[PDB]
């Protein structure tokens, strides 16, 4: 085995769990400026699961912790953009509380 701090398939398993648990699909794709024009004025450092998947497959995440950090940013961004108590915010809060366990479930070191 490679015995290393980047585990590509483990990171993809992590993203697959996040994807599947994202019932609103609110994390699935980058936000189009034409569809939701205010988003980019509120969220200046966007990230989404498709972009994270692209990065994992390309190798442009150094380590599994870097993937975890981008998922944390993804969640924080959704908590910023959406209003407390909204369905979106509820889902993002659920992710905040569980994403590290999802990483562990996937085989990553947290
Ligand atoms: C991707 O489309 C949206 C995403 C929204 C949204 C409204 C739209 C939307 C839709 C759908 N049709 O017109 C508009 C405007 N309003 C709030 C909100 N909060 C939020 O996190 N999103 C994300 C990006 C999203 C993506 C896909 C499905 C559901 N939600 C959204
Ligand atoms: Cl609010
Ligand atoms: K908010």
Author numbering: 5 to 114
Paper excerpt:
Using the recombinantly expressed and purified bromodomains from T. brucei Bdf2 and Bdf3 (Tb927.10.7420, Tb927.11.10070, respectively), we performed isothermal titration calorimetry experiments and confirmed direct and specific binding of I-BET151 to their AcK recognition sites, as mutation of two conserved residues in the AcK sites abolished interaction with the inhibitor. To provide a blueprint towards designing high-affinity trypanosome-specific bromodomain inhibitors, we determined the crystal structure of the Bdf2 bromodomain in complex with I-BET151 at 1.25Å resolution. The overall structure adopts the canonical bromodomain fold comprising four α-helices linked by variable loop regions that form the ligand binding site. Unexpectedly, but consistent with the reduced affinity, the ligand is flipped by roughly 180° with respect to the human BRD4-BD1-I-BET151 complex and cannot adopt its classical binding mode. In Bdf2, the dimethylisoxazole ring is solvent-exposed, while recognition of the conserved Asn takes place through a bidentate hydrogen bond to the imidazolone moiety. The new orientation is probably due to a clash of the pendent pyridine ring with the large trypanosome gatekeeper residue Trp92, which dominates ligand recognition through parallel π–π stacking and which is not found in any of the 61 human bromodomains at this position. The flipped binding mode is further enforced by the narrow AcK binding slot that cannot accommodate the energetically favorable twist of the dimethylisoxazole with respect to the quinoline ring. Notably, the pyridine moiety forces the imidazolone to sit high up in the AcK binding pocket, resulting in an imperfect fit with a gap at the bottom of the pocket that is filled by an additional, unconserved water molecule (Wat1). However, the negative electrostatic surface potential of Bdf2 markedly differs from the slightly positively charged BRD9 pocket, highlighting the distinct character of the Bdf2 AcK binding site, a prerequisite for developing a trypanosome-specific drug.
Trypanosoma brucei is a unicellular, protozoan parasite and the causative agent of Human African Trypanosomiasis (sleeping sickness). Here, we report that acetyl-lysine (AcK) recognizing bromodomain proteins maintain the BF cell fate in trypanosomes. The T. brucei genome contains five genes with predicted bromodomains, and we hypothesized that these proteins may play similar roles in maintaining the parasites in their BF and preventing differentiation to the PF. Consistent with its more widespread genomic localization, knockdown of Bdf3 increased transcription for more of the VSGs in the genome than was the case for Bdf2. These results imply that while both proteins maintain monoallelic expression of VSG genes, Bdf2 has a more specialized role in maintaining silencing at ESs.
